[PDB]
Amino acid sequence: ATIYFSSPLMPHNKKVQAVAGKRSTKKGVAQENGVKIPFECQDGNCGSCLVKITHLDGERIKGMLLTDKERNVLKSVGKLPKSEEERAAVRDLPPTYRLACQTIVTDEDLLVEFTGEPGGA
């Protein structure tokens, strides 16, 4: 799994290689490589770790489970439209905006964009 971190704070986009399916989340991957995603909670109820995930290999999109807590948090910051919620519920496809502490790395190439601010502007 290849992950490309991007941020206006970062002078250069950073390419890392990650092991998929780890109990440690994308937040573990970000912390090991020194990517400064704001993590301000230990229960996954805040929105500080909001990121935008783009699947570079569109053919290799893996089906996942959108947890109810993550869905509620994404709706709380207004980053989950109705169409994407229905898509996650029916087709088991991920939404565009995710939470780093709740995101499980999959075996694909990903682009993770963050702006350094907590979710909800």
């Binding site: 805040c46 509620n72 709380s76 909800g120």
Partner: protein, 272 residues
């Protein structure tokens, strides 16, 4: 149904002015709804006679998620048939402080608390910073009318200017307009016409001037609002006149921001 919001810096009598406005409106047979978009849980204590109304965020946290939340426990009716909603924020340093406003507005829309033959909805919004869930009513075109509570102090006028800029930014995407500038007195010389001059400088009209007195505090001790504490009070009738001017207001304009030096010169040439 008319959607109005009350903005301005924190500490300027915003909450109590909004409470007196809505209670006065309820005295005329109108039915109003209050949504407290301030992280401080004090936006609805003077119309429910409670220590602190339990917020939507607190109930959602205690009841697991917001999907298990019921409308009856969050919508409390007070004096005059007013509907009360209280939107608490998260703890300091835990994410955006404006998640509560977004969650509460979404919950209210989902449970259909607006269409119930309401005429006035009032969003008591923090105006120290215009961002996140605090600029959300302007971003989403939720509050069509907005009133700013300010005084003859640099912080209040700067907050009014910032809210005006926020209105200008989202002017083209919806019908969000600045109705007027509510003025609250701190017993300082030459304040009324200073605020009239600011309003005329940025295009609006002054709505009403509220002087400072001790009756509102005596009512505040009793967890009481001024009008139905003593309806014959002079300040009670002033609040009634403020309500009359608010309901019969038809001027909706797009303001123009004023620069820092302009505000400094305006403050300087008025003796302060």
């Amino acid at each position: 149904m008319r959607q109005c919001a009350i903005y301005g810096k924190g500490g300027i009598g915003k909450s109590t002015t909004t409470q007196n406005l809505v209670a006065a409106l309820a005295e005329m047979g109108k039915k109003v709804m209050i949504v407290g978009c301030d992280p401080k849980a004090d936006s609805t204590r003077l119309i429910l006679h409670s220590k602190a109304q339990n917020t939507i965020m607190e109930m959602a946290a205690e009841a697991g998620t917001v999907e298990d939340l019921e409308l009856e426990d969050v919508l409390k009716a007070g004096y005059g048939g007013v509907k009360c909603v209280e939107s608490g924020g998260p703890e300091p340093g835990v994410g955006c402080a404006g998640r509560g406003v977004i969650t509460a507005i979404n919950f209210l829309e989902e449970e259909g608390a607006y269409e119930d033959d309401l005429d006035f909805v009032f969003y008591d919004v923090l105006g120290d910073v215009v961002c996140g869930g605090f600029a959300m009513p302007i971003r989403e075109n939720k509050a069509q009318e907005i009133y700013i509570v300010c005084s003859g102090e640099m912080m209040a006028m700067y907050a009014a200017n910032n809210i005006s800029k926020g209105i200008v930014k989202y002017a083209n995407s919806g019908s969000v307009r600045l109705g007027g500038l509510i003025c609250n007195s701190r017993n300082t010389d030459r304040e009324d016409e200073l605020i009239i001059a600011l309003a005329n400088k940025l295009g609006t009209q002054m709505i009403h001037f509220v002087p400072r007195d001790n009756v509102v505090q005596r009512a505040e001790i009793r967890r009481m609002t001024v009008i139905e504490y003593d309806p014959k009070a002079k300040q009670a009738d002033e609040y009634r006149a403020l309500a009359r001017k608010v309901v019969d207001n038809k001027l909706l304009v797009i303001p123009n921001p004023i620069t820092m030096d302009e505000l400094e010169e305006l403050l300087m040439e008025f003796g302060i």
